[PDB]
Ligand binder design. Sequence first.
Ligand SMILES: [Ca+2]
Ligand SMILES: [Ca+2]
Ligand SMILES: [Ca+2]
Ligand SMILES: [Ca+2]
Ligand SMILES: [Cu+2]
Length: 356
Amino acid sequence: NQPFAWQVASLSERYQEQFDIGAAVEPYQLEGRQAQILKHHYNSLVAENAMKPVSLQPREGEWNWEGADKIVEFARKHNMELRFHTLVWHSQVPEWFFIDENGNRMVDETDPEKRKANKQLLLERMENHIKTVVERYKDDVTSWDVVNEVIDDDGGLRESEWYQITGTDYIKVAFETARKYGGEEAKLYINDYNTEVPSKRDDLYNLVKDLLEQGVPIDGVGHQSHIQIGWPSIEDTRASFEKFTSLGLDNQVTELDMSLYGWPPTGAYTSYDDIPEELFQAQADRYDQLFELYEELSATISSVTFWGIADNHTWLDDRAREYNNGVGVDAPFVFDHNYRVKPAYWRIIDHHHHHH
Ligand SMILES: [Ca+2]
Ligand SMILES: [Ca+2]
Ligand SMILES: [Ca+2]
Ligand SMILES: [Ca+2]
Ligand SMILES: [Cu+2]
């Protein structure tokens, strides 16, 4: 039976001078064993939910800073980098953004003069959101996820309310506004998932190149990295990192977890004790290879952030229950649901270098 995460060598120290090791957190996890785990193993942090647009400005001019501030205060106290998730997103965004001064839905507007008015009103609202946030946190944040999931899985830009109302300008303006209030040393990222899929990678590459050629201040690309034990391939991961490095962009892994399952995640285990040890071994093998890659590419990667700390709190539990009639569990980390280390931990902390 394995030792507890507080009883073993630090992950962040293992990867000193290669990349920071981060976790996504909620304010209420900043106590007890999870706080202990954070200090011991991570040197970087991101708010799982406290800094998303809906959390911070749920109605116009009503600002909810308290939870965000707590994460910032803990990062200050314990010398952790802080990434900001997220300034602009089609999801988890208040609907008040997309309603005009008459109470009408901007997406439904038909007359051109009013569509242009709506685009300017929406960009002003977006710019004000970003200005207030960045002015408040600019000295505490070291990477900004400026826009999140702007590329569609079937080829284009995502046809969200932002896109339908502003076209591509909400992206140009979010970056220019972040740069303006954040200063030159703010690092501005575009974040997305399935960046390893050739066709999505290319669409992001095209967007970003095009934005860079227009002088839009993009410093890096964020790779959410919601992966599985058998997908995506190391080769495809490698190709993705290198394509963006070729534009002179930093890469960060922003939301790493490795599901035990495929897609859709049926049929999930309903108990942690039901998970076979061969599956955990496979997870360890894959993490080893993944972190060997990261290391191969560490000049191109500034930060690797897991989307949580230990298996007892993961959005992947929700997603298992969503696809399995409300029951089901996932175990995507190197620390288990009781905070004990898993086979994956030993395989990413180790100094093995014999290749495979
Ligand atoms: Ca750092
Ligand atoms: Ca690095
Ligand atoms: Ca779990
Ligand atoms: Ca290893
Ligand atoms: Cu190995």
